[PDB]
Design a protein around this ligand. Structure first.
Ligand SMILES: NC(=O)c1ccc[n+]([C@@H]2O[C@H](COP(=O)([O-])OP(=O)(O)OC[C@H]3O[C@@H](n4cnc5c(N)ncnc54)[C@H](OP(=O)(O)O)[C@@H]3O)[C@@H](O)[C@H]2O)c1
Ligand SMILES: O=C(O)COc1cc(F)ccc1C(=O)NCc1cccc(C(=O)O)c1
Ligand SMILES: NC(=O)c1ccc(F)cc1OCC(=O)O
Length: 316
């Protein structure tokens, strides 16, 4: 399969990237170095992950070593929820650029549609534990993202965790200058996202699947929770193809025309997870994997369920 997908800004995006949420700061520099050595050309980052400095050390060294050229890398980061106001967006982007030691991002996403009160805390709370919202709306935050393109800080802009009505709001924005290039959403066999994916694809927005392995290292995992990597039905498809379960879980979104960003800090898994471009799942395999949907969503915050822009009350 071709390694890159064409975005609606005219640039090409590698369909396989390395995730970095939860990658410890003392391990992520080596993880990213290994990833680049073994072929990864897309790294998914965020300021809220608190490890962009260390990701940046790896990127800079591989550029300095001339393992890769900057134009061959596709670096993604995300605007955190406490920076949705007009006067904070540029500085938030520039902090990410400075940490990653880059002079542009390939893609910058609104991390969540929910804006929070600015300040030092990433989740500012009231005395009862509700997140304290910002009043800045989605559309004004989008205009601030458009400015970043026009200032040369980012080559593409997009969104993450937006439901279809929220995507539609941006597409219908008065005076829209740049369409979102990407919507990055949770997607795996237990949360297959058909409706939202079809909507986004019909509008020319590329979907990136996050937590493709079901995020088994999520901090709030419980022992009884469903496990994609241990699902015997998925293991059986993997065995039939002489591949690992993770390799099937990565190839699955690729064949749906999605980008996918599995996370690992384990060198052997980083290399293994990239070895997915040379086998095919059948149509029957694809439909069988889709059949496992249980609307099992792992990534959301209880503190945000009354925010006006909470994305997951809507069906999709
Ligand atoms: N936009 C958003 O709101 C959002 C939300 C969630 C995630 N994301 C992005 O998506 C990325 C991926 O999602 P995620 O980190 O939630 O989880 P994930 O990629 O679904 O799963 C990561 C877990 O799988 C393990 N793993 C990786 N390869 C494996 C293999 N071959 N065999 C067995 N286990 C394997 C990792 O272990 P080791 O690391 O120990 O090897 C880690 O515990 C994130 O890192 C982040 O970049 C974005
Ligand atoms: O968000 C990610 O990429 C991965 O998850 C995290 C990573 C962190 F470093 C710190 C917290 C989270 C987290 O709680 N996310 C969920 C989240 C965040 C913001 C708003 C909402 C909401 O429900 O509106 C939901
Ligand atoms: N998203 C969940 O299902 C979840 C479950 C338990 C938990 F303690 C946390 C959780 O998500 C993170 C959150 O609510 O901040």
């Amino acid at each position: 399969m071709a390694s890159r997908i064409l975005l609606n800004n005219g640039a090409k995006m590698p369909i396989l990237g390395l995730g970095t949420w939860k990658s410890p700061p003392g391990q992520v520099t080596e993880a990213v170095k290994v990833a680049i050595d073994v072929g990864y050309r897309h790294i998914d980052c965020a300021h809220v992950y608190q490890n962009e400095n260390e990701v940046g050390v790896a990127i800079q060294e591989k550029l300095r070593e001339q393992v890769v050229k900057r134009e061959e890398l596709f670096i993604v980061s995300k605007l955190w929820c406490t920076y949705h106001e007009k006067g904070l967006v540029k500085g938030a982007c520039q902090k990410t650029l400075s940490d990653l030691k880059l002079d542009y991002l390939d893609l910058y996403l609104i991390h969540w549609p929910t804006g929070f009160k600015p300040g030092k805390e990433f989740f500012p709370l009231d005395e009862s534990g509700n997140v304290v919202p910002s009043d800045t709306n989605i559309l004004d935050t989008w205009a601030a993202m458009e400015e970043l393109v026009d200032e040369g800080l980012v080559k593409a802009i997009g969104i993450s965790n937006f439901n279809h009505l929220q995507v539609e709001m941006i597409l219908n924005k008065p005076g829209l200058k740049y369409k979102p290039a990407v919507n990055q959403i949770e997607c795996h066999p237990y949360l297959t996202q058909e409706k939202l994916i079809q909507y986004c694809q019909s509008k020319g927005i590329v979907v990136t699947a996050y937590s493709p392995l079901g995020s088994p290292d999520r901090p709030w995992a419980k022992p009884e929770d469903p496990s994609l990597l241990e699902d015997p039905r998925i293991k059986a498809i993997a065995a039939k193809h002489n591949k690992t379960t993770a390799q099937v879980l990565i190839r699955f979104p690729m064949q749906r025309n999605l980008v996918v960003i599995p996370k690992s800090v384990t060198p052997e898994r980083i290399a293994e997870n990239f070895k997915v471009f040379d086998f095919e799942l059948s149509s029957q395999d694809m439909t069988t994997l889709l059949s496992y949907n249980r609307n099992w969503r792992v990534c959301a915050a209880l503190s945000c369920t009354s925010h006006k822009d909470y994305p997951f009350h809507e069906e999709f």
